Design a protein around this nucleic acid. Structure first.
Ligand SMILES: Nc1nc2c(ncn2[C@@H]2O[C@H](COP(=O)(O)OP(=O)(O)OP(=O)(O)O)[C@@H](O)[C@H]2O)c(=O)[nH]1
Ligand SMILES: [Mg+2]
Ligand SMILES: [Mg+2]
Ligand SMILES: [Mg+2]
Ligand SMILES: [Mg+2]
Ligand SMILES: [Mg+2]
Ligand SMILES: [Mg+2]
Ligand SMILES: [Mg+2]
Ligand SMILES: [Mg+2]
Lengths: 50, 49, 49, 49, 155, 43, 49
RNA sequence: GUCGACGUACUUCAUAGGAUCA
RNA sequence: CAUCCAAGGAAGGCAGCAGGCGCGCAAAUUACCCAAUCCUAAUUCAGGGAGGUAGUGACAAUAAAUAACGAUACAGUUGUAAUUGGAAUGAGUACAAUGUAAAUACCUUAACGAGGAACAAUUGGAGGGCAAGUCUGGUGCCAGCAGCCG
RNA sequence: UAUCUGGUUGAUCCUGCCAGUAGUCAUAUGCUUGUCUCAAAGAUUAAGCCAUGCAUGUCUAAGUAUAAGCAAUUUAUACAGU
């Protein structure tokens, strides 16, 4: 979401602190396959920022 | 080479450092509060309502 | 934690509009804070005191 | 309150600055200017390079 | 003021009412210097037309309203839109505002001569600290509005 | 809920404008070969 | 324990414990007001210049 | 100590010759 | 070297499988199972981080999608289409079945899934052109630098 | 090295020279990363130090059961199933 991205950019410019991504609501997924795809996409996008 | 960095000074006191500030930041409804309660229970064995 | 040290008598004689004296408690971080009073500090979202 | 007084001062200044932003620019800030557009001998007072 | 090398970020909207859907981090930067004054300047161009031409020499009108003005700009650098460079030689006594100029090459009547000049600009001393904690709502602090917002409001 | 847009999601940044023929190499080589044949007909 | 005087009343009245209260010391240069020269760029994801 | 010798690593200078034409 | 301690004592060896430190700068899961391979026992039956299964940075390798067939339009029989017609299909979603120790996946397959097919292919290199714009130099109007800024 | 490009002058050929262009593999790193099959995971010459969990147990009709164990019973007053 935008707020998540907005905070990271603020943190990056003011001195980046330790950042741990925590993904929730994963039980809402109905397929194991799509869950893994979302995790992989979510993780790689997160890696670019941090 | 990757061990080398710009030399800087760390001012953290040698004795009795302050607690580390852990900020639970996220969009509304993502589960910030329920994360804190779960974490606090693990370290202290008591639930904060 | 946050505490207002203003004497309630002053609150009633002059009214709620009067400026208040407040005490703030917490752990210090970063470089040591000088002991002598008169140090300038900025409270985010309030101003400089 | 003193904060409220600051708010009236600020709001007055915001009204002034909004009006200035809306107002048509001065001749010096129009880029090209011909003798007709600007006041006669306007350049006499002003310092131009 | 703050010490050099201090990074910062800038935003245009902090109120939840005006958040919208776009990204709210508007600017980023690093402070380079601290000072009490600055000399911003802006380009100001004077626009006139020629009316009488003698090969290189020519007479121009609409730079200036009176020979008072031409008096300072003698020897000033001028050029046409075509790029022919010239000089403001002397002010004609009659009419007011007319002056003699010499160009490297003969100019045309349709040409427009322009004088490049620099006009100083001043920084506006406006300071509105954000005091969200003092507000009841704490999330709709609103200050001076944007130019586009103001124009929309007044229609 | 303010979901991130396409620019933030893909994060393609500043890239040059590329012709659609680059998306499939087969089409690009097909066009190149037919153009080459039209050039042979002139040689 | 740090005690501040001349604190605006709105801070005491409109006090929400959810919003953190961050105090920061100020070096001498932070006190001074003046013109700041900086290198600035529009954020890449910001729509408008 | 702008020290000597050695070892090591580099930089640099020495490329035009014959035939025709004007 | 190092853990507990009531200070009297007690307990240590991951170059096993996971997972940490060694920096202030970094990289597989503290996952499921003995179903296959074989091993141990008093033994067909219990046990096996040996081993297998799945997850996880493009290690090294194989195959291979991102469009195909036409009409119209415009321009110098060639090129260009945010033009247009109805046919094809998997990336993905998903009843089901198969798969598996149980699962995921593969192979199958009802029903969905295409015009900007935005269901939005990348990494490098070369060469332009534009201004009432900016800088430098001088056998005039030029040349060089360059040009997100007029 | 080869091939190709360019420079060696007032110009064009013929020589010669000079500069750049070859390679897989290895290390580190950058950008991108849709499908099927398949597969590996060392390294500071630091065999340097390890929180936590697991990684070695094993019973057939056929060595020893009055478990005050379970369930079956008069198939069993020596026992007899598990
Ligand atoms: N199904 C599901 N619900 C979740 C999960 N995490 C949070 N929730 C639900 O989300 C709701 C909000 O949880 P909160 O703990 O209040 O999250 P929050 O950060 O405190 O939200 P705010 O305080 O409103 O800003 C609760 O009803 C949770 O049950 C998750 O992983 N799965
Ligand atoms: Mg898949
Ligand atoms: Mg909450
Ligand atoms: Mg290990
Ligand atoms: Mg036996
Ligand atoms: Mg990468
Ligand atoms: Mg694609
Ligand atoms: Mg498929
Ligand atoms: Mg018995």
């Amino acid at each position: 979401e935008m707020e998540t991205m907005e905070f990271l950019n603020i943190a990056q410019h003011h001195g980046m602190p330790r950042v741990l991504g925590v993904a929730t609501h994963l039980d809402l997924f109905k397929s194991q396959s799509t869950l893994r795809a979302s995790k992989k996409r979510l993780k790689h996008r997160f890696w670019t920022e941090v | 080479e990757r061990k080398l960095h710009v030399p800087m000074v760390d001012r953290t006191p040698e004795d009795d450092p302050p607690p580390f500030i852990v900020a639970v930041v996220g969009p509304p409804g993502t589960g910030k509060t329920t994360l804190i309660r779960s974490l606090v229970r693990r370290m202290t064995k008591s639930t904060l309502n | 934690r946050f505490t207002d040290l203003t004497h309630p008598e002053l609150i009633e004689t002059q009214g709620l509009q009067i400026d208040r004296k407040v005490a703030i408690y917490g752990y210090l971080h970063g470089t040591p804070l000088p002991s002598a009073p008169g140090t300038r500090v900025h409270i985010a979202g309030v101003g400089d005191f | 309150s003193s904060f409220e007084k600051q708010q009236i001062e600020i709001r007055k200044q915001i009204e002034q600055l909004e009006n200035e932003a809306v107002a048509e620019k001065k001749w010096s800030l129009k880029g090209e200017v011909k003798a007709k557009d600007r006041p006669e001998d306007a350049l006499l007072t002003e310092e131009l390079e | 003021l703050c010490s050099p090398n201090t990074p910062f970020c800038g935003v245009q909207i902090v109120a939840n009412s005006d958040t919208g859907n776009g990204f709210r981090i508007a600017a980023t930067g690093i402070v380079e210097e601290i000072d009490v004054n600055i000399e911003i300047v802006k380009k100001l161009k004077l626009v006139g037309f020629p009316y009488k031409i003698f090969k290189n020499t020519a007479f121009i009108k609409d730079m200036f309203s009176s020979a008072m003005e031409v008096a300072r700009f003698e020897g000033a650098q001028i050029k046409t839109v075509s790029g022919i460079r010239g000089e403001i030689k002397r002010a004609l006594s009659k009419p007011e505002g007319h002056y003699r100029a010499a160009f490297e090459d003969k100019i045309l009547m349709s040409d427009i001569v322009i004088l490049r000049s620099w006009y100083p600009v001043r920084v506006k001393k406006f300071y509105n600290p954000v005091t969200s904690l003092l507000l009841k709502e704490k999330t709709e602090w609103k200050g001076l509005r944007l130019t586009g917002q103001i124009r929309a409001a007044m229609n | 809920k303010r979901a991130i847009n396409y620019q933030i999601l893909k994060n393609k940044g500043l890239t040059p404008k590329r012709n659609k023929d680059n998306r499939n190499s087969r089409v690009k080589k097909r066009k190149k070969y037919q153009k080459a044949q039209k050039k042979l007909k002139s040689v | 324990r740090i005690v501040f005087e001349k604190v605006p009343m709105e801070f005491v009245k409109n006090f929400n414990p959810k919003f953190p209260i961050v105090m920061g010391g100020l070096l001498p240069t932070e006190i001074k007001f003046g013109i700041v020269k900086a290198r600035l760029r529009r954020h890449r994801w910001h729509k408008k210049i």
